[PDB]
């Protein structure tokens, strides 16, 4: 019979650090009770349980005044401390392509383009067959968060490898000044 | 459009307390209670930053109490377990004889208490394994990662056994070369 009390201090940034929203929220089991939204400037109750704290705290002026300023003393503060290794972290993606099925020419199988070991997550992937870009029937596994500040994705493509074809996976990512290409033939 | 989140949680009876920093989804660090110190997700971060750990311990304390307080005027409404979705992937594409890493994503669960085990050919693996404290998630549930280091082989096969109150029987996801 567990009881859980969460607490989250989040700083939201828009356009570098020109507009910032501090959000201090105290959560019960998984039910958020009270919160302080810099965009309001005072604690508000989200459910019944929080009302008490919503009052007791909104009464403490040294508290409110500290909270309202937290937007800089806290948010804009840490943002600038960890910017270099967080906001501007860049890791090039290593790309690998490989046929799913095992079948002689003329038989219809998946082509997988593994785009791994990259950060930020923001990335674009494209499929090419003999210079003509593919758009239809492209399945994507979506983006993966490896947990070690690294992303990964899989973009599959089905076809009927005919002799002489050249499938190429083209990737574009912030860590790259020029797209990375990987071909594959029959 | 980045976000920094000082996510902290405390839970009874377990008395497991956690304090951590999150950025755009990944953890920057957490404060090791026992060691009363700071633990960086990436050693590089350390050469880059610093954090006075003693102050984290404070918050958790208030948290522990804040809980006890809420745990009461809720009419002891207990936490409703949420089953964890489990999955397995390699950090990078696999080639025989090419050392790689198996990832086990334990995602979308609660409470932040769980039991994980890596299995190589049926047997539990003990060396070459690491993990992460309970990571927060926008939906207020938790995320957990585990890592096994291996050397792809045809005979070898693995399993990430996960247990959690929200399940009847432990969860067992499989993985093997191709």
């Amino acid at each position: 019979p567990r009881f859980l009390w969460q607490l989250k201090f989040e700083c939201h940034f828009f356009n570098g650090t020109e507009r910032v929203r501090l959000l201090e929220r105290c959560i019960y089991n998984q039910e958020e009770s009270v919160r302080f939204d810099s965009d309001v400037g005072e604690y508000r109750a989200v459910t019944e349980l929080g009302r008490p704290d919503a009052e007791y705290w909104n009464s403490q002026k040294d508290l409110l005044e500290q909270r309202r300023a937290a937007v800089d003393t806290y948010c804009r503060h840490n943002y600038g401390v960890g910017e270099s290794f967080t906001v501007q972290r860049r890791v090039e993606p290593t790309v690998t392509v490989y046929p799913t099925k095992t079948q002689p020419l003329q038989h219809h199988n998946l082509l997988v383009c593994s785009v791994s070991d990259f950060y930020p997550g923001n990335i674009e992937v494209r499929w090419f067959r003999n210079g003509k870009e593919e758009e239809t029937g492209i399945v994507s596994t979506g983006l993966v968060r490896n947990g070690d500040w690294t992303f990964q994705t899989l973009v599959m493509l089905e076809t009927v490898p005919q002799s002489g074809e050249v499938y190429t996976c083209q990737v574009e990512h912030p860590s790259l000044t020029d797209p990375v290409t990987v071909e594959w033939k029959a | 459009e980045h976000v920094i989140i000082q996510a902290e949680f405390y839970l009874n009876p377990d008395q497991s307390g956690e304090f951590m920093f999150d950025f755009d989804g990944d953890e920057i660090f957490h404060v090791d209670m026992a060691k009363k110190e700071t633990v960086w997700r990436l050693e590089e971060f350390g050469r880059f930053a610093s954090f006075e750990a003693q102050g984290a311990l404070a918050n958790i304390a208030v948290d522990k109490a804040n809980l006890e307080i809420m745990t009461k005027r809720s009419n002891y409404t207990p936490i409703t377990n949420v089953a964890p979705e489990v999955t397995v992937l390699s950090r990078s594409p696999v080639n025989l004889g090419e050392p790689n890493i198996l990832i086990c994503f334990i995602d979308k669960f609660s409470p932040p208490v769980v039991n994980v085990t890596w299995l190589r050919n049926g047997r539990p693996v003990t060396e070459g394994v690491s993990e992460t404290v309970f990571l927060p998630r926008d939906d207020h549930l938790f995320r957990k990662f585990h890592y096994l280091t291996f050397l792809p082989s045809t005979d070898d096969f693995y399993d990430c056994e996960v247990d959690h109150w929200g399940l009847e029987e432990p969860l067992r996801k499989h993985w093997e070369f191709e």
């Binding site: 607490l7 201090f9 201090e24 105290c26 008490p52 704290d53 009052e55 007791y56 705290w57 403490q60 508290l63 937290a70 003393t73 806290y74 503060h77 840490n78 401390v81 960890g82 | 000082q6 304090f19 920093f21 880059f48 930053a49 610093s50 954090f51 006075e52 102050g55 984290a56 404070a58 918050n59 208030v62 948290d63 109490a65 804040n66 307080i69 809420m70 009461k72 005027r73």
Partner: peptide, 14 residues
Amino acid sequence: AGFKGEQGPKGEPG
């Protein structure tokens, strides 16, 4: 040389 923690208020006893 860095990171601050955002202190927190205490709950209303109940």
